[PDB]
Design a protein around this ligand. Structure first.
Ligand code: OEM
Length: 268
């Protein structure tokens, strides 16, 4: 009846803000969230999902922001990030822009996916590349000044590229970005020619770009389609109620409403 939930900031799925200085509380559609290191309030698409699950299923929760890495990476036998919090049973569940992949699915249970995603590439509107099938990407060191392109490492995007396109991955390493905000800054400054990342996030960023100067190209057949899912302990008794609720939200057009509310933009 009381769940500990791990999350991670990734706008607009999870957005972190200070408490209202006037009231010292979380007002509007926000909820209290503390840091794993230990005030702060969280809102966004995934938080609205969490609020609805809590109400529909009938649990209370304690929400915290992960500081031990980000989404989840396995290094030398040990998981960090949201996946690690769930895998090591520090949290009952983790929710945010958490991408379902084979590696993670082996060790945690995932809810049914509630956001469709995958991998896409974002470029400046003028930049002449065809997409991720382009040799500028695929054979990066075959030309005069090489194309500069990178990702934010340590997550499902990098894992997918390393597994499927190890030569391209080795090239991208020097262009790793610390977060999406910095990657976008480098794209606009021409320090990167392309940014390869989660499709749901990139599409949102392109829809919100000032001047509509950034465009995304879907990866097509280069990478598979997947989804965000809620991570739970392997064998969790929470998987079924959560799945049924999510499936219900989908059919009630509640998820579509949340998409309109949180993910809509101006550019097309
Ligand atoms: C939005 N997904 C994150 C970051 C990434 O895909 O690289 C992840 O699940 O790892």
């Amino acid at each position: 009846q009381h769940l500990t939930v791990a999350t991670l900031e990734e706008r607009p799925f999870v957005i972190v803000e200070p408490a209202d200085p006037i009231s010292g509380t979380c007002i509007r559609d926000s909820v209290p969230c503390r840091s794993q290191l230990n005030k702060r309030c969280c809102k966004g698409f995934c938080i609205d999902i969490l609020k609805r699950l809590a109400h529909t299923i009938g649990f209370s929760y304690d929400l915290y922001l992960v500081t031990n890495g980000k989404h989840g990476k396995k290094i030398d036998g040990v998981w960090n990030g949201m996946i690690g919090e769930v895998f090591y049973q520090r949290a009952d569940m983790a929710i945010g822009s958490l991408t379902i992949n084979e590696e993670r699915s082996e060790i945690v249970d995932f809810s049914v996916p509630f956001v469709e995603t995958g991998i896409s590439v974002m470029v400046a509107r003028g930049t002449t590349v065809s997409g991720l099938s382009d040799r500028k990407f695929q054979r990066p060191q075959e030309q005069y000044p090489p194309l500069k392109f990178g990702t934010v490492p340590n997550g499902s995007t990098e894992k997918n590229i390393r597994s499927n396109y190890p030569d391209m991955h080795s090239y991208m390493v020097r262009y790793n970005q610390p977060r999406v905000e910095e990657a976008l800054t480098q794209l606009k400054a021409g320090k990167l020619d392309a940014f390869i990342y989660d499709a749901a996030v990139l599409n949102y960023m392109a829809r919100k770009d000032e001047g509509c100067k950034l465009v995304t190209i879907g990866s097509g057949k280069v990478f598979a389609t997947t989804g965000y899912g809620i991570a739970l302990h392997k064998g969790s008794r929470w998987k079924r109620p959560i799945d049924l609720a999510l499936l219900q939200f989908l059919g009630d057009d509640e998820i579509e409403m949340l998409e309109r509310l949180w993910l809509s933009g101006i550019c097309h």
